[PDB]
Design a protein around this ligand. Structure first.
Ligand code: CA
Ligand code: CA
Ligand code: CA
Ligand code: CA
Ligand code: CA
Ligand code: CA
Ligand code: CA
Ligand code: CA
Ligand code: CA
Ligand code: CA
Ligand code: CA
Ligand code: CA
Ligand code: CA
Ligand code: CA
Ligand code: CA
Ligand code: CA
Ligand code: CA
Ligand code: CA
Ligand code: CA
Ligand code: CA
Ligand code: CA
Ligand code: CA
Ligand code: CA
Ligand code: CA
Ligand code: CA
Ligand code: CA
Ligand code: CA
Ligand code: CA
Ligand code: CA
Ligand code: CA
Ligand code: CA
Ligand code: CA
Ligand code: CA
Ligand code: CA
Ligand code: CA
Ligand code: CA
Ligand code: CA
Ligand code: CA
Ligand code: CA
Ligand code: CA
Ligand code: CA
Lengths: 354, 354
């Protein structure tokens, strides 16, 4: 209770419809503005209470973040079509966050805490500094996300400023790090103004060519290397990741990292992904079921799998049709060779959902 | 949406009031029964709305976990005082989970996902086996919670069965591990029938004396060593931890593990905690603000601290009055000796909230 009191919605109306009349003043009122771009709801009671539930979630987030200068609004895809075209709102059910000169699309779990955590991340500065051996270890501990790190003279360096400009383009989904510490740069093998790109779960980085790097060179490189061989599904971006597949067919690996059997399978998956990381056609989404408890019974019934054991399979996003690697039980995990056999069969189409 | 469809409440009334007339019927209907013990809500509209919101959270959890044999019910502390006393429901706002011969008290964040995640943990078996070096590594990776591991001949061992009996008494809050692997036991330095107790964040375990250990011997040891020197606040048990104050105060350390500065402060805190782990009067609650986004603005306003930087201080649990260690900014972290001197001043009353 005292010192540990979750906020409860006070009923004050803070999330309003944004339209051609007020959108210019609403932007002036709030330093950071989050606009949910939505289609008009249907009269169905299941979709009626659904839409009212969404706005109340934004109402709680608006209350929690009021003092930090964050505002929330709603934009109707039909009623406010001219406003949506002017602002760049194009994907229904996405929430567009306006910070400075940037527009950030939120396409993640629509819950109050996930949205507030995301907005708190948006409020942070886009570049994290690294100085000393212990901060370097914190950088090295990052593995489940893409990361960049550059070595510059100081914050006054023109090349640091270009690095920060590029960081703003991907904020807050890709952490950018900068060091002015020559001893840190030496251990990372970074020469002056060099920037290293670390693919998720990869040990070895890729150095951005053509140093020093303009904002344009960094942004183009990151866009070219956007898709990791192994990606971890995260609530803040779960629908963006789920929708980011060419043929709507995912290789999905379920592994509970804290469980001994899940850990064993995760080791093999990471090693295979590392050994095959140059394959431009291989991409695997790792889901830790402990990150999505409300989806665990849904997954087990829809996929006909037991999520207390590791799994890897093929999922068709059209109708959740799926096929899974055969294991006798949790102790019959594939070797790296067996896993590589199975992935090659999936890429060739020999193993499929159809 | 297909493959990533969060469940929505279907309006079916699955959570009902459990009273002296129906309580035996309800226990018979469900394998596992979770009963929320609550006072009657106040009659004003806001109090009524908040109560209906909490029951809808339970209705969603009951819908998600219906096929797994879980049911939820409400017990009124005024209307149902007799049946509450008979069932051992004594702490208002606690949810008591009945599995087998055990009653598990839930005293954590009242959210649908946290509750469903907790119930899925309850449904798991209370002892996890360790076999092989890679599963041993998974055990060694556990550090933010108390863990026990024992070496027995097989599942048929009388001493394994006593170990499993004791595990059920702390399920699912303290993971119990067992190995029948002599190679794993040798690495852990476990002799046959020995049980090692690992306090959270400690590198060295404490062997339970008096092997072979009966259930009562294990339960008494764990209860006597229940409070770690450094314990992490977790949503599943946040109120149990917060209500376990030390003479009306908590020493609270805010540190974001993923942030380089939070990581640095966390290293020092873990080292000081290990160096002072024998002091029974020292206990520190580590809060990672990334784990409680909905409480971050509340904390910054209530404690008057900047949660973008690491913090440690004293919090009075009666009125949330607080005092915090002064640091210029996130780079002005205390050394291990400075942190230990500050903790000593707190334990002597030289630093206090009054
Ligand atoms: Ca509250
Ligand atoms: Ca509203
Ligand atoms: Ca969406
Ligand atoms: Ca831009
Ligand atoms: Ca989308
Ligand atoms: Ca954060
Ligand atoms: Ca700039
Ligand atoms: Ca730009
Ligand atoms: Ca981020
Ligand atoms: Ca290099
Ligand atoms: Ca260049
Ligand atoms: Ca999108
Ligand atoms: Ca595909
Ligand atoms: Ca297991
Ligand atoms: Ca196992
Ligand atoms: Ca790759
Ligand atoms: Ca979880
Ligand atoms: Ca195994
Ligand atoms: Ca096999
Ligand atoms: Ca099929
Ligand atoms: Ca749904
Ligand atoms: Ca009901
Ligand atoms: Ca409670
Ligand atoms: Ca309580
Ligand atoms: Ca949540
Ligand atoms: Ca779990
Ligand atoms: Ca037994
Ligand atoms: Ca017992
Ligand atoms: Ca647990
Ligand atoms: Ca030993
Ligand atoms: Ca004994
Ligand atoms: Ca309690
Ligand atoms: Ca920092
Ligand atoms: Ca720093
Ligand atoms: Ca201790
Ligand atoms: Ca978080
Ligand atoms: Ca204040
Ligand atoms: Ca100082
Ligand atoms: Ca630092
Ligand atoms: Ca002293
Ligand atoms: Ca005071």
């Amino acid at each position: 209770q005292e010192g540990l009191d979750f906020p409860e919605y006070d009923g004050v109306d803070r999330v309003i419809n944004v339209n051609a009349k007020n959108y210019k003043n609403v932007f002036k009122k709030y330093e950071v503005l989050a606009l949910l771009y939505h289609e008009p709801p249907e009269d169905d009671k299941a979709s009626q209470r659904q839409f009212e539930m969404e706005e109340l979630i934004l109402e709680l987030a608006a209350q929690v973040l009021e003092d930090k200068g964050v505002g929330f609004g709603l934009v109707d895809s039909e009623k406010d079509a001219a406003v949506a075209k002017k602002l760049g709102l194009t994907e229904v059910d996405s929430m567009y966050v306006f910070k400075g000169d940037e527009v950030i699309e939120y396409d993640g779990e629509f819950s109050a805490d996930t949205i507030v955590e995301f907005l708190l991340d948006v409020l942070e500065d886009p570049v994290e500094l690294i100085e000393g051996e212990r901060e370097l270890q914190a950088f090295e501990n990052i593995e489940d996300e893409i990361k960049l790190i550059g070595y510059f003279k100081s914050k006054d360096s023109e090349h640091y400023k270009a690095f920060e400009d590029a960081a703003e383009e991907f904020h807050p989904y890709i952490p950018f790090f900068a060091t002015f510490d020559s001893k840190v740069a030496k251990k990372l093998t970074l020469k002056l103004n060099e920037i290293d790109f670390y693919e998720a779960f990869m040990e070895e980085p890729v150095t951005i060519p053509g140093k020093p790097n303009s904002e344009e060179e960094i942004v183009n490189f990151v866009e070219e290397h956007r898709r990791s061989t192994l990606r971890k599904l995260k609530p803040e971006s779960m629908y963006e990741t789920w929708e980011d597949d060419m043929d709507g067919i995912h290789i999905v690996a379920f592994a509970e990292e804290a469980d001994p059997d899940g850990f064993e399978f995760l080791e093999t998956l990471k090693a295979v992904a590392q050994d095959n990381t140059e394959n431009p056609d291989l991409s695997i989404i790792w889901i830790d079921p402990d990150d999505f408890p409300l989806l665990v019974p849904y997954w087990e019934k829809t996929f006909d799998i037991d999520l207390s054991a590791p799994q890897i399979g093929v999922v068709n996003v059209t109708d959740a049709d799926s096929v899974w690697m055969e294991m006798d039980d949790e102790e019959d995990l594939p070797s790296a060779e067996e896993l590589e056999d199975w992935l090659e069969d999936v890429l060739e189409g020999e193993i499929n959902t159809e």
